[PDB]
Design a protein around this ligand. Sequence first.
Ligand SMILES: O=C(Cc1cccs1)N[C@H](C(=O)O)[C@@H]1NC(C(=O)O)=C(/C=C/c2ccc([N+](=O)[O-])cc2[N+](=O)[O-])CS1
Ligand SMILES: O=C(Cc1cccs1)N[C@H](C(=O)O)[C@@H]1NC(C(=O)O)=C(/C=C\c2ccc([N+](=O)[O-])cc2[N+](=O)[O-])CS1
Lengths: 13, 13, 13, 13, 13, 13, 13, 13
Amino acid sequence: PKFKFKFKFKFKP
Amino acid sequence: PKFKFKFKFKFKP
Amino acid sequence: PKFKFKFKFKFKP
Amino acid sequence: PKFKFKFKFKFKP
Amino acid sequence: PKFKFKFKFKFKP
Amino acid sequence: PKFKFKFKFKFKP
Amino acid sequence: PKFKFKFKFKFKP
Amino acid sequence: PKFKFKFKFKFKP
Ligand SMILES: O=C(Cc1cccs1)N[C@H](C(=O)O)[C@@H]1NC(C(=O)O)=C(/C=C/c2ccc([N+](=O)[O-])cc2[N+](=O)[O-])CS1
Ligand SMILES: O=C(Cc1cccs1)N[C@H](C(=O)O)[C@@H]1NC(C(=O)O)=C(/C=C\c2ccc([N+](=O)[O-])cc2[N+](=O)[O-])CS1
């Protein structure tokens, strides 16, 4: 089949 | 000093 | 089982 | 002064 | 194929 | 305010 | 406030 | 023909 994974990381000091 | 990361993965059968 | 991967990194000081 | 790096890799088994 | 993603976030005060 | 982030993405066929 | 980001991508045929 | 991509980002104040 088709699998899509998106990972987003946002960093604030 | 904000950091933004985007990761995209696509699976094709 | 074809694989496509995209990585985006953004850093702002 | 912001730095952005993007790398995309596609491969087939 | 089965693709597995692990995300770890650590923040120090 | 140190931040450590680890992300791992793996594919098993 | 030092920041460490780790991204890992693994592809197996 | 396995492909591995690692991205590391380090920010220092
Ligand atoms: O976290 C780990 C240990 C693991 C256990 C299980 C899975 S991975 N992975 C990395 C590795 O082993 O490869 C570590 N990565 C860093 C970093 O943190 O950049 C290192 C620098 C050492 C350092 C640290 C902390 C500080 N600090 O907080 O000041 C300063 C340094 N340094 O640069 O000397 C090298 S060792
Ligand atoms: O740890 C290592 C060495 C490395 C150090 C750093 C990056 S690799 N061993 C590899 C690994 O596990 O990753 C070899 N790979 C595999 C497997 O998949 O378990 C094996 C089976 C068959 C195969 C499938 C795919 C490929 N491929 O994609 O190239 C190659 C082999 N092979 O015959 O070695 C035997 S071991």
